[PDB]
C-alpha cells in the first residue's frame, strides 16, 4: 500500500432535514454526529485485509462537512436535493431514493469532481424500508469521480456519490444501525456487490456469526459478522483499490 495514497477523502453534506433532526438545529451536534460515524466506519475499512494478508490499511477521512441550515428555496418546475418538498410525490415524507441519489449527484457535482467520495446524510423515510443508496457495485461508479453526461441535466455529474437517511419507519435509527447502512452504501463505491445467499461463505446462518454487512438485507448489527467485509466484498474490492488510490486517494492525516 502506498502511505501516501490509502484514504479517500470525503465531502459530506448534511441537508436541512438531518440537520433540523439529528444535528437538533445545531452546527457542533450535528459534525460531531457525522465525525463519529465516519471514524467508526473508517475502523471497519482500515483493519480489512483485502487479500487476507498485509493489504490492509485503506480507509476514509472527512475533508468537508456542509451543512445545510434551511431548505433550499426554488422556482417552480425546479428541483434540489435540498428543497423543502419530496420528490416526485411532495405528498411523501421522502423522495424516491433513486431520483434523490440523482439529484445530489446532480447539484454537487463540481465538488464532487474534486473529492474521492461525496456522501449525503439526510433524515427521510424512503418507502419500504430502504435506508440507503449509492453508485458502484451494481449488477458503473464509485470511488474517484467518473463523468456521466446527463442528457436530461445537460450536464457532466459525476458517479462518486451515495446517501444515507437515518430515518426509518417513523423513527431514528440506532447508531449501529446508521454505522452499517454507511458502510454498506461506502461498500458500493469501492466496488462490492450485495452478498448471495448461494454461496455459504459470504452470506453465513445467524449460528456462524450471520451475514456480512454487504447482505441486501439490513444486518440488525448484534451478530459477530454484521460490521465486517465478506470474502465476496473483499475479493471484489480488491480489483477496485489499489488502481483507484493511484487516482484519487490522499495520506492519512
Ligand atoms: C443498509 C441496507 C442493507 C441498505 C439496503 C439498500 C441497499 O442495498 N443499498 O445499497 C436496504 O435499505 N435494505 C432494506 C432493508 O433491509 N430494510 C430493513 C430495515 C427492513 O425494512 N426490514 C424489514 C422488512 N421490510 C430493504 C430494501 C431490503 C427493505
Ligand atoms: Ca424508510
Ligand atoms: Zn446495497
Redesign the pocket.
Given at each position: 500500500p502506498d502511505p501516501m495514497k490509502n484514504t479517500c477523502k470525503l465531502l459530506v453534506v448534511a441537508d436541512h432535514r438531518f440537520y433540523r433532526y439529528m444535528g437538533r438545529g445545531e452546527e457542533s451536534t450535528t459534525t460531531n454526529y457525522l465525525i463519529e460515524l465516519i471514524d467508526r466506519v473508517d475502523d471497519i475499512y482500515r483493519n480489512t485485509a483485502w487479500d487476507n494478508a498485509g493489504f490492509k490499511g485503506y480507509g476514509i477521512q472527512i475533508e468537508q462537512i456542509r451543512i445545510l441550515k434551511s431548505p433550499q428555496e426554488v422556482k417552480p418546475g425546479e428541483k434540489h436535493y435540498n428543497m423543502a418538498k419530496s420528490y416526485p410525490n411532495e405528498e411523501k415524507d421522502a423522495w424516491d431514493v433513486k431520483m434523490l441519489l440523482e439529484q445530489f449527484s446532480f447539484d454537487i457535482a463540481e465538488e464532487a469532481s474534486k473529492v474521492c467520495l461525496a456522501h449525503l446524510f439526510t433524515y427521510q423515510d424512503?418507502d419500504?424500508?430502504?435506508?440507503?443508496?449509492?453508485y458502484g457495485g451494481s449488477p458503473h461508479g464509485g470511488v474517484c469521480p467518473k463523468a456521466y453526461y446527463s442528457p436530461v441535466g445537460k450536464k457532466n455529474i459525476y458517479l462518486n456519490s451515495?446517501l444515507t437517511s437515518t430515518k426509518?419507519?417513523g423513527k431514528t435509527?440506532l447508531t449501529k444501525?446508521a454505522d452499517?447502512?454507511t458502510?454498506?452504501?461506502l461498500?458500493?463505491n469501492f466496488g462490492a456487490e450485495?452478498d448471495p445467499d448461494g454461496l455459504a461463505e459470504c452470506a453465513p446462518n445467524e449460528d456462524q456469526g450471520g451475514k456480512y454487512?454487504?447482505?441486501?438485507?439490513?444486518?440488525?448489527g448484534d451478530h459477530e459478522n454484521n460490521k465486517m467485509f465478506s470474502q465476496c466484498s473483499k475479493q471484489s474490492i480488491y480489483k477496485t483499490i489499489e488502481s483507484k488510490a493511484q487516482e484519487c486517494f490522499q495520506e492519512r492525516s
Open positions: 424512503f419500504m424500508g430502504t435506508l440507503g443508496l449509492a451515495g426509518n419507519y435509527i444501525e452499517l447502512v458502510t454498506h452504501e461498500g458500493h450485495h454487512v454487504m447482505y441486501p438485507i439490513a444486518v440488525s
